[PDB]
């Protein structure tokens, strides 16, 4: 099993640490705040109060032993940048860091961060897509033009069949799944019916899907 | 006109406001900080400096005209809670609010928030899934058991065919798409080939996919 | 005997705790300030320094055992709201909370507070009634129209008898008590005399009493 | 004209100012905070931003015209004390001041305050009486021994008559009023009936009433 | 020997404590600052860190045993006033307090301070008298009209005799002493000579002395 | 014209400025606080808001015109020191400065201050002399050994004559003045009488006077 | 025109700006503090108040016109780093930055700083060399082994000649200059004499010079 | 060996302490910050946490034993000045102090500082000389007119000989050294060649050198 180190137990890093630990991985939670450590003590293999900008405390943690180190420090850009620098000079294989803005991304890029993440910005995009289009529940982009979308079926689609709703020739899309009352249906047959308030998964071009939304539902 | 209002120009709300504006929607940016307002002025239809906890300043914005109001206030839970309370008493149809923790979710729930979002927490889980499994790029959960995953093809899958990589019978899964050098292939034929570093889209049970990952790739 | 818990040893909560303890009830004083606890240590069954927003410290207090919990936190609305939420999730029978303003009342209402109190606001009304009318010492409202009032007798009423001051037919009111030099007289006979600077208790309609005040005294 | 001035727009003083204004009196609202002044501007004849510790600003208000000046300053004891001192040296007839603790009462006493009020402390006692005894709604003390109490009638008293509930001979008390469904009854006849959840007004000795509570209801 | 207590080890109180201790009196130095106590530890009989606003700590000091208590607290008027109040309620014979301004004097007056001192204000007057008149070194006022002054002899008075400088008939004053090279001369004879830069002590009317200054020296 | 400038409107400097102005001198009040300047505006010829550490603001005041500049800055030793330094480099004739402690005296000494004053320290000694000896009202030291003292006559000295109270032979001292009911007597004759509570002025050796106090009065 | 811009008017940057201006170069002084800008206004061609972390304010300065931009920001490492990042992305040719510590040097290095300076650190070494060796006034290092040193001639070297003080054969060094009473001598002849307290310039190996110091002087 | 004491472990003082310790001298590092002491603990003979403004702590250090004491306190001018004063009163032989500005220099001068240093200001001058003239690497001034300069050789001087570049007659200067690829050449012969990007050391008049720069290279 791979060993993970998470520095900065915020909302983001906290989720990572908690979710990773649930996966049965060796995860070390690191934070400068004692209260933070106490909170996630029950959600980590080891939890240590430490200042990650201190090289001596860093070596005391044995952070060189870890293949993955996650820097989830946000507000204090100084701490985030300085920590990443220390890690890179310690030849840490994989360093993932949470960024605050465009310029924070740039400096992390230059000092050799392996992966940079913008949690709020990315979610901001996702939720915005669901505001303008209440029909969509969730989605994933395959490219700039193609995407898979989970839709909330309306009354317009109630008791409609898959062959009634021709998507492969009329809109160039394909229905991938139907979720009814919790029960799930994968690669549903052309005779399969969709009822309102079910979860509908469609695959195809972005413009095509929206066209199906405007006309079909 | 569908009018959107975004209160709290943080990393999350800022993205929402910017992304909503990009889609060509009437969007009003609202913040207590003048510097924030000046920043997102170029990324909104209208940008106004205002304290959202003030009912008078709130009415001055013409907030009755908005169908959607997004409360993206984070650090100051008092402001977030009080703003949401004001909106519901002003009979705003749809109120989406960013939450800080479990208990903030609860109080927002009781006072009639329509949708509660945990941006950092949700991304934390997503990134954690990619930490433990370097193969996965992105995914979407259909249910507690079923998921769609975009995989980074390895050398083990280089120049391998779909009928060669039998997933419908061997693993109970199905290949949805292949992305090669940017070019995309939807519902690929059994003769379609996968090269290394291509994007592979697979659909099925979580455990099944992971089995394909360990043995297949 | 019923067991009471008082969180927030301010001027209000302090009085409650002190007065309840004097009544020979089991009362627990709780405050985040060590100095507060030391002050009311002599006025409680048990006095414990604790942060009421901490669920672990809350369970350590055994707050689930109490039928009555009084939240007298004022300035910090966050603490007051969060504490009440914790209590409600712990299924506490009776939760009384001190409020700061109209909107603080609303959120406490929504999260299931059993009784909300506005000490200063209510007293503000009481004292205001005594400013405009120096004759009144204290009072109680039976309804929007009817009230009982304690009056300071003037020279105009000196050596006047109850039958001389006809209140039942002339003003529709009734004299309930006379307090002379500390000595008290209940349901006084029609032959009973009132001297100046005595305490006079009258019952009837608000407008009628004021009429008696303008004309009678 | 009787002119009232309220200094210190807190919860207490704010209510006073608002309530005085409601009675149709000439009321001047005074506060050091501009936001406070703006708030109670609609609830006062005149509202002026001013530091009450400044004699020049005080004279500028035209404070000689006011017969009543209310000092409702709480947190800053220095401001409360200094303001009161200024008023008496400006020969203001009646100076009522809100007190924070025992020692604040003492110093205000020595410097010639006409009336000292303890809003939170007084309500604390009142509420405490209703905590230990859920039957009582409100009350007023005639003396150290005698009191008038408004009771919430129980099922034990449902459909019971006044002559049935003998209190003048059995408990030494007297029923003053009955409030049923909003309708009020003053000095009710011996044939008048009490239904559950009605408001019952009783007069007598404190111990006597409590005896009626334990045995009668 | 009399026992003295000095609260507030500032520049003023510090001098008092140091000077009193040098006189061989039992003096207690009291201050809230630990650093202050350490400084004057070598200049007092007993030195104790204590908050003088705390009644319990006050009794622990045994402050009731002292005939003289000096309150030399300046900046914090709250502490100065509250301390004096505690002392007066403890029936302390002689309470001397340092004042900050006119209104601080008034409240101390009302709460029963025995003597109030204005060190800086009084010295301000003294030094101002020496600025306008460089001839005067020091002085003492017998009344509004009469004073004793120590003068710095000029060249105009060099080698002048007392009988040459007639002061009893010409100016109505009298020379009291001559200080030459450190050597002192008391009640000097009419034949006694004064040299420049000696210290000259004159007694008489203020206007008369100034007249002697303008014409004589 | 002799022009005086007072920098630092504290208790000390404020008195100086006020007292100098009372004598009819051209006095400029200077302070960094606008509120201070407004206060002593009525007690100065000119009052200007200025930071005395700024050479430009200093020259703007027209400080070259002043022969006397008084630095009465206390708390901020940096400001006091820097101001004094500027004045000497601006070749100001006479610079008097208020000192905070021994070391502040030393640095001011080295940088060419003309006179250094310790207002609180000097009064502390004076008051201490009156604490140990309730008989003394005020005094002045002629040297290390000789002093003039104003005494409050006791009953022991009531109706006693000067020849009765022989001090020139019995104690080696001399009576300089007697103040009775406000009326003053200078160089009183051997037949002049002293009544109780009169002011007695004695001149001589410190030990001699104290001997007269113990035995004589 | 060669245009220089100096950002951060500290002790270091202030000297740079002042010195550059003295040489007759077009120099722009930039600082976030208005007081700083006002100060160096007289020592720059143009002086503008600006926050250097703001790209808009940066472009407003006309920073594209400058070939040299000096970042002399010290305390705020965030500002220093962010400013440098902005400059390189604005394609500024030569960016010189003042560093605070080793790690600040590293990050500035990675983001493309052209020259990094350690003013205090460099002087610290220089002064240290003069502490241990009182003979040396100043020096310059040619390499790790070779240096040029200016020495203060002792009495041991007074009236000694260059051929008398043989350094080319005896110590392997060479005398470059002699400064006597201000008068300078370059490449002095073998007959040239050295007097005490003259400035002696020697060139050679570090160890050789020190040997000459111990034995020769 | 001489014993050194360094107070104020900043960038400047830190370098001094580190460099001196490397020279094998007895050096004491003194700082009020515990973190500072821990940092330079490895770079000093003794390292002690102490407040240098405290005379008692100063004597505890045994600072009187040291011949050299370096005050490297910058930001807090009060501490720097007060420390120097203490040292001078302790008769410390050599006291070197770091200054912040012109006026800080003056007070240090007056209170008897032996040497005053301006690290940033001096370096500011040095670097400024290298900005305007990119050819110069480092230099030393012999006087106002004469200086030794280290130059970066250009292509214009590539493969040029010393006799080709006549400096003694044509420009009045002399080439002192050539540094090629790290290898150094001292007092190079007239036949010696210079290649580009070598370090060139020239000695002569400032204007003459610049003339050689403009025309020669
Ligand atoms: N030098 C440091 N060493 C260790 N932990 C640190 C350091 N600096 C910051 N942290 C921790 O990082 C955590 C989260 O950082 P912060 O909250 O500033 O970023 P954020 O973006 O606001 O967080 P979120 O992930 O909730 O958005 C905090 O709990 C803090 O204690
Ligand atoms: N009462 C208010 N009215 C209007 N705007 C407010 C109010 N309170 C806070 N804001 C704004 O909301 C913005 C975002 O708040 P904050 O930065 O605390 O969120 P966050 O927890 O950092 O979330 P994010 O992940 O979006 O950064 C702030 O820039 C602030 O100016
Ligand atoms: N999280 C907490 N846990 C325990 N006690 C708290 C907490 N937050 C506040 N308190 C306490 O509540 C007490 C009173 O609250 P606060 O004084 O803010 O309200 P208030 O309205 O100003 O008081 P008052 O009743 O005098 O009007 C304080 O003594 C404080 O210590
Ligand atoms: N010197 C002053 N002049 C005028 N107004 C003042 C002064 N000092 C305080 N105030 C005002 O008095 C108001 C009430 O004071 P404060 O909030 O401390 O009282 P409180 O103890 O909270 O009592 P309450 O129960 O009424 O809230 C404040 O809003 C403040 O603006
Ligand atoms: N509650 C308290 N108990 C004990 N000591 C106190 C208290 N409050 C203040 N002091 C002390 O009083 C001392 C002097 O008071 P402060 O310096 O505020 O008055 P000041 O007029 O500025 O002094 P100075 O006599 O130098 O003019 C301080 O050392 C402080 O520690
Ligand atoms: N740089 C400055 N320029 C002008 N005025 C100043 C400066 N620094 C301080 N002052 C003023 O000097 C005044 C007196 O200073 P401070 O109150 O610290 O003296 P203090 O020690 O309290 O002496 P006092 O016994 O006179 O009160 C303050 O009101 C302040 O406004
Ligand atoms: N973002 C910014 N934009 C413009 N100027 C800034 C910014 N941040 C700081 N400065 C300015 O830089 C100046 C120097 O910074 P600072 O005083 O922290 O440096 P220092 O470490 O003291 O170096 P020095 O040895 O030069 O004094 C400050 O006067 C400040 O006004
Ligand atoms: N009273 C004191 N006793 C001991 N050390 C002190 C004292 N005051 C300041 N110092 C120390 O002096 C050190 C440097 O001083 P400071 O950083 O204020 O000057 P600076 O000019 O900013 O430093 P630099 O040399 O980096 O320019 C700090 O580490 C601080 O701890
Ligand atoms: Ca966030
Ligand atoms: Ca209150
Ligand atoms: Ca003072
Ligand atoms: Ca510096």
Numbering used by the authors:
A (entry chain A), B (entry chain B), C (entry chain A), D (entry chain B), E (entry chain A), F (entry chain B), ...: 6 to 222
From the primary publication:
KtrAB is a cation channel with a nucleotide-dependent RCK domain. The structure of the KtrAB complex revealed a homodimeric membrane protein (KtrB) assembled with a cytosolic RCK octameric ring, formed by the KtrA protein. KtrA binds nucleotides, ATP or ADP.
In addition, we crystallized wild-type KtrA-ATP in the presence of 5 mM of Ca2+ and determined the structure at 3.0 Å resolution. The structure shows an octameric ring adopting a square conformation with L1/L2 distances of 30.5/30.5 Å that are similar to those of the WT-ATP structure. The intra-dimer interface shows a bound calcium ion. Unlike what we had observed in the wild-type structure with Mg2+, the R16 side-chains are not in position to coordinate the divalent cation.
